[PDB]
Coordinates of N, CA and C in Angstrom, one line a residue:
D1 N 46.9 1.4 -13.4 CA 48.2 1.9 -13.0 C 48.2 2.5 -11.6
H2 N 49.3 2.6 -10.9 CA 49.3 3.3 -9.6 C 49.8 4.7 -9.7
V3 N 50.1 5.4 -8.6 CA 50.6 6.8 -8.7 C 51.0 7.2 -7.3
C4 N 52.3 7.1 -7.0 CA 52.8 7.6 -5.6 C 53.1 9.1 -5.7
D5 N 52.9 9.7 -4.6 CA 53.2 11.2 -4.6 C 52.5 11.9 -5.8
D6 N 53.2 12.1 -6.8 CA 52.7 12.7 -8.0 C 53.3 12.2 -9.3
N7 N 54.4 12.7 -9.7 CA 55.1 12.3 -11.0 C 55.6 10.8 -10.8
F8 N 54.7 9.9 -10.8 CA 55.2 8.4 -10.6 C 54.0 7.5 -10.9
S9 N 54.3 6.3 -11.3 CA 53.2 5.3 -11.6 C 53.8 3.9 -11.8
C10 N 53.0 2.9 -11.4 CA 53.5 1.5 -11.6 C 52.3 0.5 -11.7
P11 N 52.2 -0.2 -12.7 CA 51.1 -1.2 -12.9 C 51.2 -2.3 -11.9
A12 N 51.2 -2.0 -10.6 CA 51.3 -3.1 -9.6 C 52.4 -4.1 -10.0
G13 N 53.4 -3.7 -10.7 CA 54.5 -4.6 -11.1 C 55.7 -4.2 -10.3
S14 N 55.6 -3.4 -9.3 CA 56.8 -2.9 -8.5 C 56.3 -2.2 -7.3
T15 N 57.2 -1.5 -6.6 CA 56.8 -0.7 -5.4 C 57.4 0.6 -5.4
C16 N 56.9 1.6 -4.7 CA 57.5 3.0 -4.7 C 58.6 3.0 -3.7
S17 N 59.8 3.0 -4.1 CA 61.0 3.0 -3.2 C 60.8 4.1 -2.2
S18 N 60.3 5.3 -2.6 CA 60.1 6.4 -1.7 C 61.4 6.8 -1.0
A19 N 61.8 8.0 -1.3 CA 63.1 8.5 -0.6 C 62.9 9.9 -0.1
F20 N 64.0 10.5 0.4 CA 63.8 11.9 0.9 C 62.7 12.0 1.9
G21 N 62.8 11.4 3.0 CA 61.7 11.4 4.0 C 62.2 12.1 5.3
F22 N 63.3 12.9 5.2 CA 63.8 13.6 6.3 C 63.4 15.1 6.3
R23 N 62.6 15.4 5.4 CA 62.1 16.8 5.3 C 61.3 17.1 4.0
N24 N 61.5 16.3 3.0 CA 60.8 16.4 1.7 C 61.0 17.8 1.1
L25 N 62.1 17.9 0.4 CA 62.4 19.2 -0.2 C 62.6 19.0 -1.7
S26 N 62.2 17.9 -2.2 CA 62.4 17.6 -3.7 C 61.8 16.2 -4.0
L27 N 61.9 15.3 -3.1 CA 61.4 13.9 -3.3 C 62.0 13.3 -4.5
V28 N 62.8 12.3 -4.4 CA 63.4 11.6 -5.5 C 63.6 10.1 -5.3
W29 N 62.8 9.3 -6.0 CA 62.9 7.9 -5.8 C 62.5 7.1 -7.1
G30 N 62.1 5.9 -7.0 CA 61.7 5.1 -8.2 C 60.8 3.9 -7.8
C31 N 60.5 3.1 -8.8 CA 59.7 1.9 -8.5 C 60.6 0.7 -8.3
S32 N 60.2 -0.2 -7.4 CA 61.1 -1.4 -7.2 C 60.3 -2.7 -7.7
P33 N 61.0 -3.6 -8.4 CA 60.3 -4.8 -8.9 C 60.1 -5.8 -7.7
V34 N 58.8 -6.1 -7.5 CA 58.5 -7.1 -6.3 C 59.2 -8.4 -6.6
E35 N 59.4 -8.8 -7.9 CA 60.0 -10.1 -8.2 C 60.7 -10.0 -9.5

């Protein structure tokens, strides 16, 4: 399994959307399906 930032994970079955990159005061995103 993977692990982006901290509270997150994905069995290489998606990607870390990654959001809140203008200062990082909470970080809120999800995993995206590569296909």
